[model samples]
Target chain A: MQIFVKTLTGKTITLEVEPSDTIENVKAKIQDKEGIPPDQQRLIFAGKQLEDGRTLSDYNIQRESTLHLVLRLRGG
Target chain B: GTKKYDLSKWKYAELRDTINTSCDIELLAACREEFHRRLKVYH
Candidate 1:
């Protein structure tokens, strides 16, 4: 399915992935698209972690679903 | 034909509301243009 994702800085990106794609793969994809470091990446959907090893189907994601990719950074 | 606006004693909110009502489209477009320009500079 195709999904529309947004970064915390308001950058919008879209991707196509199979239901078998894991959260870790999504994290890597987001990092590639948003220039966010893997160590600093954290994705939250519906207020919960889209943790590694979990499939898109595990989270019940559907086509055109929007996910928020939040980067963990510190500073003013 | 006549018009009245108490600009002399206009509060912040009143001035803001006036600008929002009258200049929002141009101001918002300019802001968006500037924001994208900065993004281009960054990227």
Candidate 2:
């Protein structure tokens, strides 16, 4: 299955994933593709923020689902 | 398993247009599948 990871800047990353993959797994994949650290990547789907341990199926993210990626602010 | 869209009813021209112009990856994949089916039909 595939999902779209959209950034704030209108760029979308199309990721081929399985329903059993955790949100953290998706984040790590994003980090590999976009060079964004998993800790700094905040994924939002259906207006709800995603947690690390939860699986994508837990969120009911069907095929072609689009998730928004918000970057976390760095500490001083 | 993810939801699979049935694009079998779509016209060839529409599928071609979608394949050429759409940026939505999901839609593109659906369109591409239908396009290949049509190709196999004609060849």
Best-performing candidate as measured by TM-score? 2
Of candidate 2 chain A, the 10-residue stretch with the lowest lDDT total is A67-76
**Relative to the unseen true structure, what is the C-alpha lDDT of residue A37 in candidate 1, on a scale of 0 to 100?**
73
RMSD of 1: 12.3
Model 1 misplaced regions, further than 4 Å: A74-76, B1-43
**Can you write out model 1's per-residue Cα lDDT over B1-43, one digit (the tens) per residue?**
1243334444444443333333232332333334334446753
Global fold similarity of model 2 (TM-score): 0.62
Each prediction's RMSD over C-alphas, in Å, is 12.3, 14.2
| Per-model TM-score versus the true fold | 0.56, 0.62
Model 2 chain B lowest lDDT segment of ten: B16-25
For candidate 2, lDDT tens digit of each residue in A1-76?
8999987556999999989999999999999998989887767777677789899999999999998776643332
Off by over 4 Å in 2: B1-43
